[PDB]
Structures are given as structure tokens and as C-alpha cells.
Amino acid sequence: YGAIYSVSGPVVIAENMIGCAMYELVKVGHDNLVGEVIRIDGDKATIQVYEETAGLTVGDPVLRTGKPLSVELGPGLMETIYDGIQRPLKAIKEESQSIYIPRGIDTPALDRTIKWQFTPGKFQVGDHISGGDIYGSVFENSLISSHKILLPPRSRGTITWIAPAGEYTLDEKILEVEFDGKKSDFTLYHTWPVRVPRPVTEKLSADYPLLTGQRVLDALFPCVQGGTTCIPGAFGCGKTVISQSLSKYSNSDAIIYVGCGERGNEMAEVLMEFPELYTEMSGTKEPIMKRTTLVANTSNMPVAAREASIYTGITLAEYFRDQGKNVSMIADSSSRWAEALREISGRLGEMPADQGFPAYLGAKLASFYERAGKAVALGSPDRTGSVSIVAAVSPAGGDFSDPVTTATLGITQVFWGLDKKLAQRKHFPSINTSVSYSKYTNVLNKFYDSNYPEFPVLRDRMKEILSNAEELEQVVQLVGKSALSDSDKITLDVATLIKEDFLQQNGYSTYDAFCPIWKTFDMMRAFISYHDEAQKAVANGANWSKLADSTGDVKHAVSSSKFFEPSRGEKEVHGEFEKLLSTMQERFAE
Amino acid sequence: LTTAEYLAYQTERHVLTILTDMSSYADALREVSAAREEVPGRRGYPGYMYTDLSTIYERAGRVEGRNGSITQIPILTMPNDDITHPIPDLTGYITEGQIFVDRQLHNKGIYPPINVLPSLSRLMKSAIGEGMTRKDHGDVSNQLYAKYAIGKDAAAMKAVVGEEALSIEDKLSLEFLEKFEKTFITQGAYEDRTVFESLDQAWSLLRIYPKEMLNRISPKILDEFY
Amino acid sequence: AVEQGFNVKPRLNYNTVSGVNGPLVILEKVKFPRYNEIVNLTLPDGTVRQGQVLEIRGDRAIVQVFEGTSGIDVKKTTVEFTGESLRIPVSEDMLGRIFDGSGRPIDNGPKVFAEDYLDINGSPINPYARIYPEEMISTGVSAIDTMNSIARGQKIPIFSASGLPHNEIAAQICRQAGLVNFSIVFAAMGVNLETARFFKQDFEENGSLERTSLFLNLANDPTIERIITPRLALTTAEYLAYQTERHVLTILTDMSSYADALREVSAAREEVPGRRGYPGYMYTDLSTIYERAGRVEGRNGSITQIPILTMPNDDITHPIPDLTGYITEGQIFVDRQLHNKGIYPPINVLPSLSRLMKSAIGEGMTRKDHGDVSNQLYAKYAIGKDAAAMKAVVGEEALSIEDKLSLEFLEKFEKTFITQGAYEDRTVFESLDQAWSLLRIYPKEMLNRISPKILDEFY
Amino acid sequence: NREQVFPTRMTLGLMKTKLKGANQGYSLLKRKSEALTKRFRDITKRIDD
Helix, strand or coil, X not given: CEEXXXXXXXXXXXXXXXCCECCCEEEECCCCEEEEEEEEECCEEEEEECCCCCCCCCCCEEEECCCCCEEEECXXXXXXXXXXXXXXXXXXXXXXXXXXXXXXXXXXXXXXXXXXXXXXXXXXXXXXXXXXXXXXXXXXXXXXXXXXXXXXXXXXXXXXXXXXXXXXXXXXXXXXXXXXXXXXXEECCEEEECCCCCCCCECCCCCCEECCCCHHHXXXXXXXXXXXXCEECCCCHHHHHHHHHHHHHCCCCEEEEEEEEECHHHXXXXXXXXXXXXXXXXXXXXXXXXXXXXXXXXXXCCHHHHHHHHHHHHHHHHHHHHCCCEEEEEEECHHHHHHHHHHHHHHHCCCEEECCEECCHHHHHHHHHCCCCCEEECCCCCEXXXXXXXXXXXXXXXXXXXXXXXXXXXXXXXXXXXXXXXXXXXXXCCECCCCCEECCHHHHHHHHHHHCCCHHHXXXXXXXXXXXXXXXXXXXXXXXXXXXXXXXXXXXHHXXXXXXXXXXXXXXXXXXXXXXXXXXXXXXXXXXXXXXXXXXXXXXXXXXXXXXXXXXXXXXXXXXXCCCCCCCCHHHHHHHHHHHHHHHHHHCCC | CHHHHXXXXXXXXXXXXXXXXXXXXXXXXXXXXXXXXXXXXXXCCCCCHHHHHHHHHCCCCECCCCCCEECCCCCCCCCCCCCCCHHHXXXXXXXXXXXXXXXXXXXXXXXXXXXXXXXXXXXXXXXXXXXXXXXXXXXXXXXXXXXXXXXXXXXXXXXXXXXXXXXXXXXXXXXHHHHHHHHHHCCCCCCCCCHHHHHHHHHHHHCCCCHHHCCCCCHHHHHHHC | CCHHHCCCCCCCEECCEEEEECCEEEEECCCXXXXXXXXXXXXXXCCEEEEEEEEEECCEEEEEXXXXXXXXXXXXXXXXXXXXCCEEEECHHHCCCEECCCCCEXXXXXXXXXXXXXXXXXXXXXXXXXXXCCCEEECCCHHHHHHCCCECCCECCEEECCCCCHHHHHHHHHHHCEECCEXXXXXXXXXXXXXXXHHHHHXXXXXXXXXXXXXXXXXXXXXXXXXXXXXXXHHHHHHHHHHHCCECCEEEECHHHHHHHHHHHHHHCXXXXXXXXXXXXXXXXXXXXXXXXXXXXXXXXXXXXXXXXXXXXXXXXXXXXXXXXXXXXXXXXXXXXXHCCXXXXXXXXXXXXXXXXXXXXXXXXXXXXXXXXXXXXXXXXXXXXXXXXXXXXXXXXXXXHXXXXXXXXXHHHHHHHHCCCCCCCCCHHHHHHHHHHHHCCCCCCCCCCXXXXXXXXXX | CCCCCCCCHHHHHHHHHHHHXXXXXXXXXXXXXXXXXXXXXXXHHHHHC
């Protein structure tokens, strides 16, 4: 129970804070403002307040809560909207009955006024239960049919008593664990430190791909379930379309959209649109809100909350993975998270390393991106969850040159780079083919050989075509393109066709909102077969100009392959693509 | 801004805030930050300039209960016409959108000298088109942006290398860029062009091209408006 | 001679913790603090966290505890002073084991039964006791082993970008590399956990672990452990090569990550950032890590290094590539242009060179045509790139015969010679035979960089 | 005797790319001029004949 000694912005120095611990939440002031102790010197513990520090006076009591920044994990967070800390914005608005967020608001993170249906698990009284084991299930939504209650990790012992099936709230007792004679009461929820990753038995290698939906991302630079992606922040429509595309069609059992430093009305857009979206994964259309938990942190919110939002989202995703679900946590403006870290370091007085950013920026980003990956969740039954981290980096200088971008590329597996040239052409998604990459091609070769055997060779062929035509286009812009071989002319024409029909797609269009993996494979088949057949014809001796004049119809057909509807089903569409390249082969005989 | 918040939320008015010389505000912040002998940040501007600018800018918008808004338009001055400067960079980070006034355009004599390549609006895609203003607004604005970028690239190529080396599309785009800066962007004060009139003029600019190469126009709108 | 090991030195348990600053844990009333001393911090929760001291003062030591300071309490945090710097328990049985950043074996196996406890920093090698490298250590990579062959004891780094398969190339080199004894030492700094699992599973599956002492440091692993990891690998290499008389070929990975760890450690103190944020003594640190290798006089063992950088913005002007080129003795460049064409390994041989190639590629070593074949391949590959640029300018037909044949050579070279299967083991002789097969499209009169005798005998 | 470029790391990279492209174009165009001049010498010899 120390007292405030110094206040200067969010950083509050509290005296008499002896026996405190680093990164421990302490209630600063008379309003009980949440603050994490980030520096200790003797009996003075420097605290960063997570709320508005204006009005704090010297001598205000500071209460030590004894626990780190803990997120309340359990049923009831599957649909709600949260601040940086797990502050329920909807519950705050309902309780306060105002458009403002009161200072020091103590609304519980998970509401205790809802009765949750509970069905006890396979464990019974007397059995030995270890950390992370399942001892029940809660019917949260239609989408989340079973919110399986996990015994908190690092908590173990023998079940002294287990509750029967019935509607129980979070405050009510669910199960009791004896351990070394000290009975512990476990409820429907539990808290976990956001800094500390949630344990798993083993982190498996991510194999099954995460279908972002965008054609270029799905084909050329594929991501897998449990892999970091580093999408471009805002300039390109890759992020804006990709977030909703993943939330709608990624097959992720849960989504945790994390917006740190998101613009005010840009966050209002998400909060007002995501309820409107629906999915067809189940028999009937169901809202995405039943599958998504947003961590909404506008730029107005304090810098400490901006830094903590990423941890809150990643630990919610870790909880849903420990349940055995495949999650795709989307971090919005990881660049703004890094800027928040830089601001906090400046407040603390730490020596910046690179362009004001703290030297531990790489370490923090690595400890964040390393929470991703397919993992066998601990405790029986054996279950295999996954957390995909689709994080966004803003174009600080218009190019991938910021220290945050450098660290993210150093520690990431997939990176979809922004092309300023393609964005200025309003070519969407504006993903730069040259700088982008995906280190999951080798591991995804297994899935490709299992399902679509020709996918890797086709994407390699398209990459080769794009690179060759990029070099040839540099030479064209240099020397006027007066003289070009027939093969080179076909290369440039095919690359332009690809960049206009395959790579480019309208996210808001009905046909190209979500291009499936089979549709993308069929389109690669069409485009690569067109290029190869044109090259073969030119090698035979045909004139390219006359051949293009004769095959404009075939080129229009392979362009309308994008316009082919995906809702017709894989069986019908592939039959159409089978007939598309069947007549394409014969049309080149003339 | 608290006057605007009052007038727009409690008196239910529609307030348009025109905070001018936010660069001067940031210079004042740097002066206070420098006197406090604290960890600078970039170019001496305080490390918490992002937080201060967000506290200022993020006081704009609409609230659910109260019909009334703050259409904040904070005028800003780049010290040397550089976006990469901390004040314009953080203002772009927090404030949504940006209207870029171009020294090159002003020297050429255009008014307003707004450069539409850096100029952006995040809320345009949702506040424009689909019966709100007209069916073709978003596609027309995408076509204009794409062809203006093509024109700038073609002008750079024609300056660096021979003019004849530019393609037919590049020459058409140079003509479009001339007719775009000189006729479309060029707007006398007090003219008050309606959005529909501006769209018609933009189409007249887009009728320079044959229908084939208006690639970013949706084919239905291209057929219905060409 | 190691009877001095049979000694028990009690350790002081300090409950006096003056304060905590970021990663640091400042102590007070320390009896006799030794600089760079390993310290075992015991949390109030009971967890034991290792630490190192970065600053020393009269009755004060600033411990930089590993794994952060989350949970350090002034009132209850026991701190135990191990009266020595960090030391690794070396042994000839360290081969076949996988170690963490701090030397703890992360493989499910016994602690290494130490033959000695060597300091991780080591000592500088006497230049009077250093020998110029003579023979080549054969690498399965045909591009490297033919155009940029590596001598026994040089330091030739691999300059790669963020997404290029430098890790895959490193795994291939570790799996296939050998003499034309051998004991590879692998150090991965700041690799993603997926990459570390790939390394471990690859080595166990392909049996390359029999001679590999793999040191894995994850990206989420402590930055001080990342600093310690290359010192651990080079201490193991020094031990094996010099006190065992075997050739090593250390393969360090992500020296860019190592430099980031250096940045984090330097800014943990009050050091002002240098040119690009990295400390001004990065030259010294990289020089120590690199020049830990090399041949020696009395010992029949060598250490080779493959630092494998990660160029941040695909530029050489960056301090990490600049200093690495200054200390090291060659360059191997991984190219995004080659990578985007599906060519593995995506190594371009134009910027890549080995300054000590003439020693490694000889007559007693390799085969006697190696140097001339490599020079001819480089010249014709440069001519092929020039002709590829020239074709789109002056038409295919107007190219000379020496340009059309050179285009054909370039296509065959990139798609068959450089393009090597990830698990295809190409000995130096097989790679040279493939190189001759590529060169044979030229009539003997055109191959001018090859000596007349070798041309008449091998063609 | 220079270009009015705002000093920035991105602008530095853009100008390095411009310099590399200009050097490549200069070499390519010098070689093209040499080839075209050889063709021109052949053309003028055929003109005399």
C-alpha cells in the first residue's frame, strides 16, 4: 500500500512500494487506475498507468494487486469487444449509460450475469487432473458449440468435487482440486498473465494452409494454419479485404481481431460492420460476431493499453488454441504497437537503438510472433490447436525500411509486401511479387501433393514468368521495346494478363470476394497452359501478332476465368475449366 | 476541440473544426519537450507526439446516442514538403485521410494545387457510391487515380528518355494528365462544383481513352456511363 | 592434471536487490562482484532465472537476468553468485547432441559428461601459430563447391535476404559437407521455432547429427543467450579442432539476429547507438566471432565458418554486411532474382567469390581443372547475362554466335548446374563433370580462359 | 547539378535504384550504338557498291 511520489504523464513513481514485483498491476490513485510496475528502485516503483493520469496527486494510495496483467479467459469473451486491457466496451457503455469511458472503471472482463450451460467432462471425482485438462463444456454460440472448460495451466491435483450439469455463472464454483491438501476452487473462468505464453506439450509443424482467399496470397505466397504473415498495413487493399476474407472463409474456428493504434472511425467501421457479416460454414448463415473477439484500441487510448492490446489478443488466441481450435489472430497496426513500445521506452528513459525504437523491439516482436503455430494442447484429451498471426505493418516511409518492418521480416515466415506502384495503379490486392515471400511453400508441398499435385510447379512457373517479364519490362522501359523476340513478347503479354486477371481481384465483387483453392489452381492451370502453348506455337514458327489476333477469344476466355463464379461448386466449375482448356488446345491449331 | 465536442454532442450541432498550423502546435510541443530535458524521439519532437496528436485528432466523429459530429479538418504545414517529417507522418498515422497540397502544382499555377496521388481518404469507399452519390463514383475515382499515376510515370519516362519511346497508352495518359490538372483539378474559388458535375467532368476526361483500356472501371458501369 | 576440479567453492546468496531496470537487476552490498559472472536469480514464485552482470561497482553489481525481469521482487529474490564466468562442459561426445543458447542440451538426453570446462570467450589465436588454408572442405552445393570453393580454415559468409532459403542452404551444407575427421558445429541465432524444429528433425532424420553439435537459439529465446550462442559454438569448434585434431566447419546462422542481440545488450547499458543503431564495437565483436576460426601450426585441425548473414534491406552498405565482408574472406550471395525463378539454391556466382579459392582448388586437391573451369564458367555466365540483356535491345538474330551459344549456356547453367535438389549430394568431381558438360557446347576454340593443356585433355 | 530529392532512407534507395538502372541503360545503349554502327558501316559500304 504505497503512496504516489511522482506523476509525469503515464509514468507514475510510487513511494513505499516495497515488496512489489515487476510487471504487477497496481491500482494507482483514489479512482483505482490500472497500472503495471515497469521499474523498481529501492522502495519506489515506477508505474505506467493504463488510464488517464490527469488529476493524480502526490500521496494518493497505490494498491498492489499481486498479479501481472491478467486476462480473464473463459466463456463469455467469444463475441464481446474489448479495449487494450480486457475492458468490455459494451458492458462499460451499458453500466455507465454514457458515451464516455469512466476513469478507473471496474466492470468485470467477463460478465457474471449470464447463466452458462455446463456439461461435465470425462473426469470424475477422485481422478487426477493436470494443467490444461478438459473437465466440461459450455454451449456459447451456435458456432462455438462446445466452449470446453480448461483447468488452468500450472494448476494440478486430484478432483475433490466436480459440479453436475446445469446452468452456472462464472462466479459459481465448478470444480475443486486438492493438490497437497490445500483444496483449490476452480470456476468457469480463469486468469492468465498476458506476458507469459500459455504452455503446450509440443508445438507441431503447421501443415494445412490458411486460405486467405486472395488469389495471389493463396497461390504465390501461401500461409499455413499457425504461421505469421506480416500483411501490409493500410495502403494496399490486401489488409482491408484480407481481414474480412479470413474472418469469413479462413476455416478458422475462432478469430481475434486486434487493433492497436487503429484510427477512431476505422475502428468504428469494424465494430459496426463485423456484426453484419455472415458465414456459410454451418447449415444456416450465422454472424461472424459469434466467432470473433475484437481487441479495439484506438490511438486515443493510452500508450500502455496500446502496447498491452497485442498481448491480450495473442493470449486470447492462445486460450482458444489450448481449447483445440484453429485460430487466426489478426493484429492491426503492429507498427503502432511498436510505436507504443518506443513511446514507453522514451517515457522510461531507455536509450533508443534504431530510429528511436528500443533495442528490445526485436525481442518483443519475436516473443509475440513466436506464440503462433500448431500445437498439441496440454492435458487430456489430446487436441491440436493453432494460432495464425496475420499482423499488419504500416508503410512508414512508403517502403519496407522501418526497424519494425526489419524485425518482423527477420522473425516472420510469410511476408506479403506492399507495391507502391501497384497501389498507385489501383491494382488490388497491391502485393509486391518481388519482395514478398512465404517460407511455408516447402512444408505446404505435402498438402499440395495430397490435394492439388500440380500446384507447386504451377506457382513456380508463374513466379518465373513474373520475374522474367519484370526484367524484360525494365529492359523495355530502358530501350523502347522496338525489338523483342516472339517468346519475349509472349512473356510480357502473359505477365500482363496474369497481373490483370489472376493477381488482380476485386474483394468487394461477388465473384472474386473469395477465390477458393481449387478455383485458384484451375486458373493457374489455364494461364500457364496458355503461356506454354503460345510459347510452343511461337517455337513452331507462327507469327505472334497473327496468333494473338486469332486467339483474342481464348485470351478473353482465360481472362473471364476470373469472372467464373465460385458459388457454383467445385464439381461444376472444374468441369467448366476442363472444357475451357480443352477448346483452348484446339484453338491454337489454327 | 472541447468547444466543438460541446457544440456537436450536447447542442446536437454539426461542427467542422479547422485547426490550422498543427505544425506550429507540434513545434510548441517540441519546445516544451526540449525544456523538460526528456528523451527526444525523432527530429527532437517528443516521443509522445503520437499520443498527443491522437488525443487531438481522435476527438472527431459521430456518437451513437447524439446526432452531431466534428468534421475535423486540421490544416498542417510540411516543413519542407516532406511527408516523412514526424508531424505529417504521425498526422497521417492518426488522422484519417489527407489532402496533399502540392508545391509543384502551385508552381504550375493550378488551384487548388491538390496532388491526388498522396491525397487519400479512408472513408471514401464507404461514403461514396452505391446510391449515396452515384453508381460510378468509386470506379471513376479509381480510374482517375490509376490514369494520373500512369501519366506521371509516362511524364518521367518522357523526360528521362525520348518521347517517341512512350507507348500509345503513355501518350494518351500524358494528354489525360494535362487535361486533368488544367481542367478537372483546376477549380476557381467560389465555383462550387457539385459531386455529380465533378463526376460528369471526370467521365469527360475518361472518354479520352477508348473503352478498352479503362480497366479499373467495372464493365457494367463502363457500358452504362461511357 | 584436472585435479583442481575437485574443489567446492561455496556461493553467496544475496537477498539485497537495490532495484530493477528493464532487463537489469541491480544488487547492493555485493562482497566481491566479478565482471561477466553467471548469476542464478531465484524469483519469489520460486522459479530460478540465470543472469549475467554487465556493470560492477563498489559493493554493487548490475545483473542482466535472462528471460527478462517479469516478477523480480526487491523483498524476496534470492540471488546466487556462481564464482566464475559462463563455461561449457565440452566433450568429444558433444557430437550428436542439440544444445540451447546457454549450453543446456534441449535434446531428450543426458547432460554432457564434461572432459573440461572451457571459457566461452576463448582467447585470440596467435598469428605466428596460424597457417594459410590449403585444402577444400567439399560442400554438396555445386555452385559453392565449383565457383566459390571453400578452403580448410577460411571464413566465407552467405549473404541472403529476409525470405531467401539461407536456412535451407545451411541445412544442406551441414548435411552434405565433408572432406574431399570432420565434425560440423551448427549455431542458429534467433531462428523461428519452426526453423529450429526443421533443423533438428532434418539432422536426426538424415543422420547428419552424428557429426553435428547443433546449437539452437529461438527468436523468443533471451537476447543474452543469443549473444552467448556463437561464442558457445566457436568454443566447441576450438575444442574439437585444436584439442582433438578434426575439421569443424562451423555454420553460424542469422548473424543479423546476433547483431540485433548485440544492439539489445549494448543499449541495456548506457551505450549510445552507433552508425545504424548497432554498437560502435560491432567490428570488434564480429571480428572475434569470425577470426575464432582458422588453421594452426602444431595441430592437424581446422575451423571453417559460414556466418550466413541476413541483409536487412538487400544492401551491402549496411554495417552487418560491411563489417562481415571486412573480417571474413569471401562472399556467397543468395539472390532474390534467382529465388523468384524457382532456382535452388538461389546463389548467383557474379557477386559471390572466395578470395582463398586458388589454394583450395588445385591439383593435389579436387581435380587439376577446377580453377580454370570455374573461371571459364564465371566468364561465360557474365557473357550470358550480358547477352540476355542484349537480346531485348538488339533482337535475338543480331546477336553473335558467342552470344547465342552463351544464352544457351546461361539457360543450361541456371536450370541444371545452379539448380540443385535440396537433398541431391553433388561431389566436387560430379559438379565439375556437370560444368564440363555445360562448357562442351562451346567449340574448343571459344574456351579461352582454360589453359591449352587442360582444354586438350578434358574436352 | 543535382535532383530536388528529400533526404530519406527510402529516397536514398530509390536514387540508388535509379543510378543502377541508368548505368545498365548506359551500357546497353552504348553496346546498341556499337552494333548499330557496325550495321551502318555495312550499309554505307553497300551504298557505295
